[PDB]
Design a protein around this motif. Structure first.
Motif, PDB file in Angstrom:
ATOM      1  N   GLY A  20       9.128  -4.001  19.094  1.00 30.84           N
ATOM      2  CA  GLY A  20       8.098  -4.422  18.145  1.00 30.84           C
ATOM      3  C   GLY A  20       8.362  -5.850  17.714  1.00 30.84           C
ATOM      4  N   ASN A  23       4.742  -6.234  13.144  1.00 31.56           N
ATOM      5  CA  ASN A  23       4.054  -4.919  13.162  1.00 31.56           C
ATOM      6  C   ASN A  23       3.082  -4.798  14.364  1.00 31.56           C
ATOM      7  N   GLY A  58       5.149   6.915  12.230  1.00 34.29           N
ATOM      8  CA  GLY A  58       5.422   6.245  10.967  1.00 34.29           C
ATOM      9  C   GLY A  58       4.182   5.521  10.433  1.00 34.29           C
ATOM     10  N   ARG A  59       4.211   5.241   9.138  1.00 37.88           N
ATOM     11  CA  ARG A  59       3.080   4.686   8.441  1.00 37.88           C
ATOM     12  C   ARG A  59       2.809   3.301   8.972  1.00 37.88           C
ATOM     13  N   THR A  61       3.344   2.127  11.961  1.00 41.66           N
ATOM     14  CA  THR A  61       2.661   2.370  13.256  1.00 41.66           C
ATOM     15  C   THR A  61       1.199   2.756  13.115  1.00 41.66           C
ATOM     16  N   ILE A  80       3.684   9.963   8.980  1.00 39.76           N
ATOM     17  CA  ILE A  80       4.844  10.196   8.135  1.00 39.76           C
ATOM     18  C   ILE A  80       4.939   9.049   7.103  1.00 39.76           C
ATOM     19  N   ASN A  83       4.626   8.299   0.192  1.00 43.52           N
ATOM     20  CA  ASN A  83       3.369   8.401  -0.566  1.00 43.52           C
ATOM     21  C   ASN A  83       2.631   9.772  -0.418  1.00 43.52           C
ATOM     22  N   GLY A 125       7.274   4.097  15.157  1.00 44.02           N
ATOM     23  CA  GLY A 125       8.064   3.634  14.108  1.00 44.02           C
ATOM     24  C   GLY A 125       9.497   3.584  14.585  1.00 44.02           C
ATOM     25  N   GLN A 127      11.765   3.401  12.268  1.00 43.53           N
ATOM     26  CA  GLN A 127      12.286   4.342  11.285  1.00 43.53           C
ATOM     27  C   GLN A 127      12.118   5.812  11.639  1.00 43.53           C
ATOM     28  N   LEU A 128      10.945   6.150  12.170  1.00 41.73           N
ATOM     29  CA  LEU A 128      10.656   7.518  12.567  1.00 41.73           C
ATOM     30  C   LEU A 128      11.476   7.924  13.851  1.00 41.73           C
ATOM     31  N   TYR A 129      11.633   6.976  14.784  1.00 40.08           N
ATOM     32  CA  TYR A 129      12.506   7.225  15.916  1.00 40.08           C
ATOM     33  C   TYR A 129      13.918   7.522  15.464  1.00 40.08           C
ATOM     34  N   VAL A 154      12.057  -5.773  15.887  1.00 40.36           N
ATOM     35  CA  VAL A 154      12.299  -4.350  15.544  1.00 40.36           C
ATOM     36  C   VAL A 154      12.895  -3.651  16.782  1.00 40.36           C
TER      37      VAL A 154
END
Ligand SMILES: NC(=O)C1=CN([C@@H]2O[C@H](COP(=O)(O)OP(=O)(O)OC[C@H]3O[C@@H](n4cnc5c(N)ncnc54)[C@@H](OP(=O)(O)O)[C@@H]3O)[C@@H](O)[C@H]2O)C=CC1
Ligand SMILES: COc1ccc(OCCCCCC(=O)O)cc1Cc1cnc2nc(N)nc(N)c2c1C
Length: 206
Positions: A20, A23, A58-59, A61, A80, A83, A125, A127-129, A154
């Motif tokens: 990435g 974004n 992820g959000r 993404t 994911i 919030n 994401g 983060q999600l990965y 990223v």
């Protein structure tokens, strides 16, 4: 009722694990996207009456996918996010963690329900990965390897193709990929717009 399915992660990454940049995706790869869509969408014919696959993301993404392509068509989308969206409310499933997503999908898409879940994908994401690489149902990575050190900001969080992880993660014969993906798939290096990539499938034992 919650341990049933394995998770599969699907990712495109450079040989330095970059995924990435702003974004967004550091490349534009029409064919690659087409593989992503086809893998993420495929349901065996006998099951294609009632069954849909799931894409978990992820959000960041979610936002980074061109608005015209959201939700990803023909797949149950779950975003994911802590919030408690707010999503823009709006009938796009939402959950605060990978396990809270699964719980939601089982409650929502149960024996009873019209739609049935076939496979579950984490599509990203970083983060999600990271959460998916820690999850004990993750047994499969559909990786597209980009043979260029395109600058990235990223990174994929685990060097699953490196020697230090080679007793856990194993790269599968191409015929096993095609067989898992239900279609013939290009074998070897593919060149769109300036660099070579190829499709790999990696597994680990639960
Ligand atoms: N090359 C490839 O194959 C792909 C690359 N990408 C790229 O990756 C980048 C995005 O990665 P990244 O920035 O890490 O963002 P993600 O897409 O993972 O989204 C990050 C956000 O998702 C939620 N989230 C993610 N993981 C969790 C978790 N375990 N628990 C709770 N919430 C979670 C957000 O919560 P909150 O609502 O609190 O913000 C968190 O801030 C973009 O550049 C995108 O283009 C994305 C897909 C594929
Ligand atoms: C930043 O993520 C983007 C950015 C732009 C984008 O362009 C829109 C294409 C949507 C039409 C296809 C469809 O209906 O599916 C798509 C994505 C998601 C994507 C792309 N390649 C991907 N390729 C791989 N190997 N893996 C992924 N996980 C991918 C993921 C999530």
């Amino acid at each position: 009722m919650n341990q049933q399915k394995s998770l599969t992660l699907i990712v495109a990454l450079t040989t330095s694990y970059g995924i990435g940049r702003s974004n967004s995706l550091p490349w534009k790869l029409k064919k690659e996207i087409s593989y992503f869509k086809r893998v993420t969408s495929f349901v065996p014919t006998f099951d294609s009456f009632e069954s849909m696959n799931v894409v978990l993301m992820g959000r960041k993404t979610w936002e980074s996918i061109p608005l015209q392509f959201r939700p990803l068509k023909g797949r149950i989308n779950v975003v994911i996010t802590r919030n408690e969206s707010l999503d823009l409310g709006n009938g796009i499933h939402s959950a605060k963690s990978l396990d809270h997503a699964l719980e939601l999908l089982y409650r929502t898409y149960g024996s009873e329900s019209s739609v049935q879940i076939n496979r579950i994908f984490v599509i990203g994401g970083a983060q999600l990965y990271k959460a998916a690489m820690d999850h004990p149902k993750l047994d499969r990575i559909m990786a597209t390897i980009i043979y260029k050190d395109i600058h990235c900001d990223v990174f994929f969080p685990l060097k699953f193709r490196d020697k230090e992880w080679s007793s856990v993660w194993k790269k599968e014969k191409h015929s096993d990929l095609e067989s898992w993906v239900g279609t013939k798939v290009p074998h070897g290096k593919i060149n769109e717009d300036g660099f070579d990539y190829e499709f790999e499938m990696w597994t680990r034992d639960l």
